[PDB]
Write a protein that binds this ligand. Sequence first.
Ligand SMILES: Nc1ncnc2c1ncn2[C@@H]1O[C@H](CSCC[C@H](N)C(=O)O)[C@@H](O)[C@H]1O
Ligand SMILES: Nc1ncnc2c1ncn2[C@@H]1O[C@H](CSCC[C@H](N)C(=O)O)[C@@H](O)[C@H]1O
Ligand SMILES: [Mg+2]
Ligand SMILES: [Mg+2]
Lengths: 344, 340
Amino acid sequence: AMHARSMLHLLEETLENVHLNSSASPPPFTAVDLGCSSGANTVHIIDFIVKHISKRFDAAGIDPPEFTAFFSDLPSNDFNTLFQLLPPLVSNTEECDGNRSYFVAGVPGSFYRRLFPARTIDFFHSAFSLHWLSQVPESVTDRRSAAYNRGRVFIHGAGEKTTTAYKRQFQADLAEFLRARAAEVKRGGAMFLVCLGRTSVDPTDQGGAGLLFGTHFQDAWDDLVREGLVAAEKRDGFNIPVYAPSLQDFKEVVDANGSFAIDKLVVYKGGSPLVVNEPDDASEVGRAFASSCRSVAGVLVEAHIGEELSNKLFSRVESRATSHAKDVLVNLQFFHIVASLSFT
Amino acid sequence: AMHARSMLHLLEETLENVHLNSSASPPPFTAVDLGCSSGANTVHIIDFIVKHISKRFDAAGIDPPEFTAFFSDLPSNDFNTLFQLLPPLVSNDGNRSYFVAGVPGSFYRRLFPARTIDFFHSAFSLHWLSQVPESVTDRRSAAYNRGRVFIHGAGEKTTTAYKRQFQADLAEFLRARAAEVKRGGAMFLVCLGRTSVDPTDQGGAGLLFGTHFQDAWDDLVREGLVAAEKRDGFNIPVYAPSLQDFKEVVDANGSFAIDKLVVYKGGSPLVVNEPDDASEVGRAFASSCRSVAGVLVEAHIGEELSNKLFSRVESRATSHAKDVLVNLQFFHIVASLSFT
Ligand SMILES: Nc1ncnc2c1ncn2[C@@H]1O[C@H](CSCC[C@H](N)C(=O)O)[C@@H](O)[C@H]1O
Ligand SMILES: Nc1ncnc2c1ncn2[C@@H]1O[C@H](CSCC[C@H](N)C(=O)O)[C@@H](O)[C@H]1O
Ligand SMILES: [Mg+2]
Ligand SMILES: [Mg+2]
């Protein structure tokens, strides 16, 4: 976990690039967490954001403006849960983390399109969300197209016609997103983006996500077709709607939108997304690995397959991962891509 | 249901009182439904609001501005459900043409940044106390409501405890709202009220909570399963104001202008498809009580112990079904406020 202290730095830097209102009485400040969820991660970065902005204001001898935080995700996000975590609003002029000193709002809808009125947001934040395709590309779901991913469940495996269908899908999504964002930022505002990426030149090698969805996860899918309970043209009809861009893929769309300035762009290693308390323990490797896959896209498996038929798959992965626990602690690395954008 | 067409009129009128931005490119418009729920009622009035404002803009030959709708309620509200109902956003009835956001927190205090809201709407929510008054939950106070479950029955020290609690809540609410409306903005309020001068006679809410509902509470203590000091510790946190009670707090806050104030009869809150049917009168009656405060009963009593109470009311209501179709009337109070 000693890389979050390093990542909070990149965020600090983008936060510096934001044009603060000079006036003695600056108008309310708006911050948005895009692709929030229902966890505490969302509330903590919002906390961090308004905290730093306030500290800037104090550095110029100004009272911090009023703050609104928007928590944006798909209508299927568990806002109910999110809303119960939100700390209560500060009282009168016994005070002193813990409490909240900003207004809140949860925003339902896809961020691959407009979510807010024009020019009303100061700071957009997004983390580990932009790698989720708006949909499976139509062409890979068409049995007669060359992009139809027969026998893989994901694009790590192979198929140029399949891999380039995903990338196009990514770049359209991210284009729509950027256009939406540009219309919504204030003149002097900025954007912090972090999604997972890859270093591979070829979309067929999906780095981290490749080893997360393309090893034990499709092998379990292959063990439920080497059984009964699941058909062959069934696993072929299931496609994880996820693409991990390279710098090139990301950067292209940016200077093509041309609304945002690139203040900073970085690909690095923030590998190993498994909380493992006993490293040498072969079985903990299993359930950890499995538990990621579940939280990521377990809802999709059950919308395409049985709910108990999924518990046998997610039961085979966590059997696979322990078997091959050696090649996992060593080979499961995630590459990150961060973008620090400013408008104008 | 042929009184909603008449009530949509009062809303239309308030909507006319709002100062629309003159400019060719007016900034975003903000509308808030306070005390929204998860049903369709919320999404239709929002729809109505933005539809009227747009039509006004067109009447002056202006493109309507962008719209945001805020749906406010307590963090216990089923926002998940509410957000599934929301219609998708317009592409390049049915359809939606405004941005949405759901807002968790009590409206008896601040919910938004100063001067950012054009129109506040609230319907059938202001009559819910922010809490049972501390004094009526104190065994040693004279306001302790011994043997009633509600204030309809009796008790001046009990009834005046509620009223104070109402006025304090409504005060705090108004203060919050005043700091959040735009200079040229307006507020539409409707909750239930009474005509009675004496807080002891809670009109509609009196007959909803103070007849069969506490009688069933009296049949679960004339049994076992529930103690006597147990029904005395349970108190429906609801107050129906009179025009006095309401209007007082308004001109005491002094931020809003009263363009209109009305008490009227929008009685009978029971969907009954066979009127002469004695049993339909029961379950209708009972189902109201349930949707209203059934969560409170189970937080104070057993979940199956509540299904036997809400099972006695619906047995009581059918019994005197005659005195219910005729005596179950709700008085409403509406307030059309503008700022300045
Ligand atoms: N099109 C879209 N619009 C809004 N949210 C989306 C989205 N596509 C994916 N997401 C959301 O992005 C999230 C990815 S998981 C990210 C969790 C959080 N940002 C964190 O850093 O811990 C999910 O909650 C998912 O619902
Ligand atoms: N202090 C408070 N803050 C926010 N919402 C409140 C509240 N007290 C009560 N409410 C909400 O007000 C609602 C009363 S029922 C109102 C239904 C809706 N307004 C309609 O017209 O049909 C409930 O959903 C309740 O959660
Ligand atoms: Mg497939
Ligand atoms: Mg009592």
